[PDB]
Scaffold this active site. Sequence first.
Site, PDB file in Angstrom:
ATOM      1  N   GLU A  27       0.817  -1.217   0.000  1.00 62.18           N
ATOM      2  CA  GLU A  27       0.000   0.000   0.000  1.00 62.18           C
ATOM      3  C   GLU A  27       0.858   1.278   0.000  1.00 62.18           C
ATOM      4  O   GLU A  27       0.581   2.229  -0.722  1.00 62.18           O
ATOM      5  CB  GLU A  27      -0.917  -0.001   1.220  1.00 62.18           C
ATOM      6  CG  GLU A  27      -2.055   0.998   1.131  1.00 62.18           C
ATOM      7  CD  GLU A  27      -3.016   0.702  -0.006  1.00 62.18           C
ATOM      8  OE1 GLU A  27      -3.290  -0.490  -0.286  1.00 62.18           O
ATOM      9  OE2 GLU A  27      -3.511   1.677  -0.610  1.00 62.18           O
ATOM     10  N   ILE A  79      -4.440  12.674   4.983  1.00 58.89           N
ATOM     11  CA  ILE A  79      -4.043  11.449   4.287  1.00 58.89           C
ATOM     12  C   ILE A  79      -3.766  10.276   5.222  1.00 58.89           C
ATOM     13  O   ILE A  79      -4.190   9.149   4.960  1.00 58.89           O
ATOM     14  CB  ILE A  79      -2.816  11.734   3.428  1.00 58.89           C
ATOM     15  CG1 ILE A  79      -3.259  12.554   2.209  1.00 58.89           C
ATOM     16  CG2 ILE A  79      -2.124  10.449   2.949  1.00 58.89           C
ATOM     17  CD1 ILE A  79      -2.128  13.282   1.538  1.00 58.89           C
ATOM     18  N   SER A  89      -3.790   5.386   5.236  1.00 61.50           N
ATOM     19  CA  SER A  89      -4.405   5.517   6.551  1.00 61.50           C
ATOM     20  C   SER A  89      -4.609   4.174   7.235  1.00 61.50           C
ATOM     21  O   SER A  89      -4.506   4.091   8.469  1.00 61.50           O
ATOM     22  CB  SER A  89      -5.740   6.262   6.486  1.00 61.50           C
ATOM     23  OG  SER A  89      -6.657   5.626   5.612  1.00 61.50           O
TER      24      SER A  89
HETATM   25  N1  HX3 Z   1       7.078   6.994   0.673  1.00 59.37           N
HETATM   26  N2  HX3 Z   1       6.175   7.504  -0.288  1.00 59.37           N
HETATM   27  C1  HX3 Z   1       4.875   7.966  -0.005  1.00 59.37           C
HETATM   28  C2  HX3 Z   1       4.223   8.769  -0.930  1.00 59.37           C
HETATM   29  C3  HX3 Z   1       2.949   9.241  -0.669  1.00 59.37           C
HETATM   30  C4  HX3 Z   1       2.319   8.908   0.515  1.00 59.37           C
HETATM   31 CL1  HX3 Z   1       0.712   9.485   0.808  1.00 59.37          CL
HETATM   32  C5  HX3 Z   1       2.970   8.109   1.444  1.00 59.37           C
HETATM   33 CL2  HX3 Z   1       2.211   7.708   2.951  1.00 59.37          CL
HETATM   34  C6  HX3 Z   1       4.242   7.630   1.189  1.00 59.37           C
END
Ligand code: HX3
Length: 186
Positions: A27, A79, A89
């Site tokens: 994820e 987020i 999340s």
């Molecule tokens: N480590 N990359 C990364 C990029 C976007 C989001 Cl929302 C997250 Cl939680 C991690």
Amino acid sequence: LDAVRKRPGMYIGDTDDGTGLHHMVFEVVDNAIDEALAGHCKEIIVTIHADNSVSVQDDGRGIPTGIHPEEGVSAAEVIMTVLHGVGVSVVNALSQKLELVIQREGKIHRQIYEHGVPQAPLAVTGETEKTGTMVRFWPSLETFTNVTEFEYEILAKRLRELSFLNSGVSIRLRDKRDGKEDHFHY
Ligand SMILES: NNc1ccc(Cl)c(Cl)c1
Ligand SMILES: Nc1nc2ccccc2[nH]1
């Protein structure tokens, strides 16, 4: 996030056979890949740490940091804490600890979560020339049972599939428990 905590298997997959455990990584990687695509260098790094945590680093633009007009907290926190792939999340909710580092607009921002609960507001901690987003998470051993340690080949197999699908994205995998590493780049 309490709906997730209530029934984590329903959101992440089986929490006793290693399926859910590894899906936690996948994820985060999905989100890192999205970030990397919209950047110039297009590299992500997945690290398996010696203490059984995983980090995922992209070199994208950094996820947004400004206050979300409706929620009244940083967009990054929205987020990490609001239910929307299942979303990061979910990952945060089932992590006993999660560390977020965002490099954006000349600034480093840091924030720590425990079981999905922010310990403080996202904060500016320094200056930087780089951009990107880094998440490191410790899966909750209250949720994940039996198979509680990350299997390298399971991560490596999925990351390989992803490299073909996301051409031009460089994916590095590092195991700090034994020095094993790989580099997938189609
Ligand atoms: N480590 N990359 C990364 C990029 C976007 C989001 Cl929302 C997250 Cl939680 C991690
Ligand atoms: N150990 C532990 N497990 C938790 C689950 C939800 C919120 C706080 C928590 N602390």
